[PDB]
Scaffold this active site. Structure first.
Site, PDB file in Angstrom:
ATOM      1  N   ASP A   1      27.082 -45.963-136.929  1.00 13.57           N
ATOM      2  CA  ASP A   1      25.626 -45.329-136.367  1.00 13.57           C
ATOM      3  C   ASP A   1      25.876 -46.802-135.261  1.00 13.57           C
ATOM      4  OD1 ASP A   1      25.620 -43.078-137.773  1.00 13.57           O
ATOM      5  OD2 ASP A   1      24.696 -43.719-138.980  1.00 13.57           O
TER       6      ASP A   1
ATOM      7  N   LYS B   1      24.847 -49.188-132.292  1.00 14.74           N
ATOM      8  CA  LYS B   1      24.009 -49.047-131.549  1.00 14.74           C
ATOM      9  C   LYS B   1      23.518 -50.091-130.761  1.00 14.74           C
ATOM     10  CE  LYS B   1      20.386 -46.764-133.659  1.00 14.74           C
ATOM     11  NZ  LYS B   1      21.511 -47.044-135.311  1.00 14.74           N
TER      12      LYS B   1
ATOM     13  N   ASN C   1      21.086 -52.162-133.752  1.00 21.23           N
ATOM     14  CA  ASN C   1      22.011 -52.884-134.653  1.00 21.23           C
ATOM     15  C   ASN C   1      22.504 -54.218-134.249  1.00 21.23           C
ATOM     16  OD1 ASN C   1      21.587 -50.928-136.797  1.00 21.23           O
ATOM     17  ND2 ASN C   1      23.469 -49.465-135.529  1.00 21.23           N
TER      18      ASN C   1
ATOM     19  N   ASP D   1      23.852 -52.928-140.095  1.00 22.11           N
ATOM     20  CA  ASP D   1      24.363 -51.902-141.398  1.00 22.11           C
ATOM     21  C   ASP D   1      25.829 -51.704-141.291  1.00 22.11           C
ATOM     22  OD1 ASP D   1      21.295 -52.041-141.313  1.00 22.11           O
ATOM     23  OD2 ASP D   1      20.682 -50.918-139.920  1.00 22.11           O
TER      24      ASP D   1
ATOM     25  N   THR E   1      19.436 -42.254-131.113  1.00 26.44           N
ATOM     26  CA  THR E   1      21.130 -42.708-131.697  1.00 26.44           C
ATOM     27  C   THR E   1      21.510 -41.068-131.032  1.00 26.44           C
ATOM     28  OG1 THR E   1      20.027 -40.358-132.964  1.00 26.44           O
ATOM     29  CG2 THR E   1      20.171 -42.943-133.909  1.00 26.44           C
TER      30      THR E   1
HETATM   31  C1  LIG Z   1      15.191 -56.501-136.846  1.00 22.64           C
HETATM   32  C2  LIG Z   1      15.108 -56.255-138.326  1.00 22.64           C
HETATM   33  C3  LIG Z   1      15.482 -54.081-138.242  1.00 22.64           C
HETATM   34  C4  LIG Z   1      14.017 -55.609-139.436  1.00 22.64           C
HETATM   35  N1  LIG Z   1      16.206 -56.534-139.593  1.00 22.64           N
HETATM   36  N2  LIG Z   1      16.764 -56.244-140.472  1.00 22.64           N
HETATM   37  C5  LIG Z   1      17.521 -57.132-141.399  1.00 22.64           C
HETATM   38  C6  LIG Z   1      18.585 -56.262-141.797  1.00 22.64           C
HETATM   39  C7  LIG Z   1      19.432 -55.730-141.335  1.00 22.64           C
HETATM   40  C8  LIG Z   1      19.994 -55.118-142.051  1.00 22.64           C
HETATM   41  C9  LIG Z   1      20.603 -55.717-143.902  1.00 22.64           C
HETATM   42  N3  LIG Z   1      21.463 -55.523-144.245  1.00 22.64           N
HETATM   43  C10 LIG Z   1      21.935 -55.625-145.657  1.00 22.64           C
HETATM   44  O1  LIG Z   1      23.183 -55.333-146.907  1.00 22.64           O
HETATM   45  C11 LIG Z   1      23.947 -54.834-145.843  1.00 22.64           C
HETATM   46  C12 LIG Z   1      24.983 -54.853-146.724  1.00 22.64           C
HETATM   47  C13 LIG Z   1      25.580 -53.226-146.155  1.00 22.64           C
HETATM   48  C14 LIG Z   1      23.864 -52.754-145.517  1.00 22.64           C
HETATM   49  C15 LIG Z   1      20.674 -56.839-145.616  1.00 22.64           C
HETATM   50  C16 LIG Z   1      20.173 -56.849-145.313  1.00 22.64           C
HETATM   51  C17 LIG Z   1      19.719 -56.671-143.963  1.00 22.64           C
HETATM   52  C18 LIG Z   1      18.733 -56.919-142.698  1.00 22.64           C
HETATM   53  C19 LIG Z   1      17.081 -58.236-140.170  1.00 22.64           C
HETATM   54  C20 LIG Z   1      18.315 -59.446-141.179  1.00 22.64           C
HETATM   55  N4  LIG Z   1      18.953 -59.631-141.554  1.00 22.64           N
HETATM   56  O2  LIG Z   1      17.461 -60.784-140.643  1.00 22.64           O
HETATM   57  C21 LIG Z   1      16.288 -58.072-139.713  1.00 22.64           C
HETATM   58  N5  LIG Z   1      15.294 -59.060-138.894  1.00 22.64           N
END
Ligand SMILES: CC(C)(C)n1nc(-c2ccc3nc(OC4CCC4)ccc3c2)c(C(N)=O)c1N
Length: 460
Positions: free
Chosen positions: A132, A134, A137, A153, A172
């Protein structure tokens, strides 16, 4: 002594909403280390795999380390949620930064894309497929100009069923590889997606486009795209050649992420060229359109959530009021709000009993209320819900202003068509609603009118 997430982390605030769940900025209760926690609700997101399989994946992802991949630190599970604890990144989405630049060239595109390719190559080596991939991400590590890109992700699509709600699937279709639609796919689907992102970075338009989701998927499934727009005149054969190799239909023939890294274009343009102004202009438009449709749907959702929760909170409090007086104390409002949380299970922000207490106190501090002599539940419910809606209505106004790039105050009927196409709201349906708000209109709406249309499209 199994570990519990809220024994260790406390929530500070919300960072936003991603694929599969809410992202909360959290803090370790002992060390003070900040972390972004993805909270996946087991009631909203169905698993595709058994528990065994997912734990194996989590263990592997915690051991992987690459400068262009989000770093995972911890994993918690309880009855209703998975908690994915990762490194916090403060630079926002790539495209949001790109639209703010004054200059963008093939050298900048190439630096971006070889960060992407480099994280992907690494992940494929460890047999992890994004699927996924894009622009949403791709986050930048910090608000610095020189900031690295971190891919988020990687790994979730293999274990979690994606949302069919349009508020979650918006945008998407442009990026998905044809073989993913038909069901037999491998890691090359990630190269396709990256190839699409590069096409957009160099021209500002998606290679497969259309007035709505299924129109877009039909293009993708045919796999036909062209370099027959004026702005491709400004771009090297070399880049077009890479694109061709990444957007190759049959996956077995499509270039690998690793061989893409060694491609001439990457070699040439990532070493120490015209600005692509049309591209940056198209990207600014494309981006605005998406964020406005996105905010439209989240506003509709917030309004519907609100109605659900106002009636529910009122009934909880009516019941709890054994007096028949309409007066509850602090401790009851809390008991009730908590019981809203038991029944729904929607607030990542209310991760523990103490997060709730404080929210209640912020509400009581808002209303002109003696806090230690008991309160009228009707008025607590009003302030509590508005507070909820606030983030979504303020975002709607902002995405509206940002879309209205010439500050006309209005959006044409043609622009609405594009907005509701992306939001997958039937054409006859929104024209029908536009007729009833301003029955004299001349194919343009202001912000108040637009907002009324949305309220009408979600049952009000
Ligand atoms: C902009 C927004 C969409 C609110 N966002 N999202 C994250 C984010 C993204 C993916 C994550 N995946 C995780 O674990 C990964 C292991 C498979 C998924 C753990 C924390 C995450 C935080 C994130 C971050 N890590 O700072 C952030 N600023």
């Amino acid at each position: 002594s199994t570990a519990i997430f809220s024994d260790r982390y406390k929530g500070q605030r919300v960072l936003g909403k991603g694929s599969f769940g809410e992202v909360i900025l959290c803090k370790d209760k002992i060390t003070g280390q900040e972390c972004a926690v993805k909270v996946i609700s087991k009631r909203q997101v169905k698993q595709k795999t058994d528990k065994e399989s997912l734990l194996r994946e989590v263990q592997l992802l915690k051991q992987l380390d690459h400068p262009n991949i989000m770093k995972l630190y911890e994993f918690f599970e309880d009855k209703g949620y998975f908690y994915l604890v990762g490194e916090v990144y403060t630079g926002g989405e790539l495209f949001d930064e790109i639209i703010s630049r004054k200059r963008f060239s093939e050298v900048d595109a190439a630096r971006i894309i070889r960060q992407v390719l480099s994280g992907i190559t690494y992940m494929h080596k460890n047999k992890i497929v994004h699927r996924d991939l894009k622009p949403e991400n791709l986050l930048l590590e910090s608000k610095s100009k020189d900031a690295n890109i971190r891919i988020i992700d990687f790994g979730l699509s293999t274990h979690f069923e994606a949302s069919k709600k349009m508020k979650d699937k918006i945008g998407t279709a442009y990026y998905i590889a044809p073989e993913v639609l038909h069901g037999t796919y491998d890691e090359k689907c990630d190269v396709w997606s990256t190839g699409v992102i590069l096409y957009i970075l160099l021209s500002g338009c998606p290679p497969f486009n259309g007035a709505n989701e299924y129109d877009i998927l039909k293009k993708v499934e045919k796999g036909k795209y062209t370099f027959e727009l004026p702005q491709w005149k400004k771009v090297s054969e070399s880049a077009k050649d890479l694109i061709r190799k990444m957007l190759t239909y049959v996956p077995s023939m499509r270039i690998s992420a690793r061989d893409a890294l060694d491609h001439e274009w990457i070699q040439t343009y990532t070493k120490e060229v015209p600005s692509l102004d049309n591209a940056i202009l198209n990207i600014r438009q494309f981006q605005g359109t998406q964020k406005l449709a996105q905010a439209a749907l989240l506003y509709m959702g917030s309004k519907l959530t609100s109605q659900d929760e106002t009636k529910e909170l009122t009934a909880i409090f009516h019941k709890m009021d054994k007096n028949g007086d309409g007066q509850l104390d602090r401790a009851e409002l809390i008991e009730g709000y908590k019981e809203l949380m038991r029944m729904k299970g929607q607030d990542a922000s209310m991760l523990d009993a103490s997060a709730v207490e404080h929210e209640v106190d912020q509400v009581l501090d808002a209303v002109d209320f003696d806090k230690n002599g008991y309160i009228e539940y009707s008025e607590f419910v009003t302030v509590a819900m508005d507070r909820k809606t606030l983030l979504s209505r303020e975002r709607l106004e902002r995405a509206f202003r940002m879309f209205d790039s010439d500050n006309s105050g209005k959006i044409s009927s043609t622009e609405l068509a594009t907005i509701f196409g992306v939001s997958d709201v039937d054409s006859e349906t929104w024209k029908s609603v536009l007729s009833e708000v301003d029955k004299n209109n001349d194919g343009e709406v202001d912000f108040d009118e637009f907002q009324q249309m949305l309220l009408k499209l979600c049952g009000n």
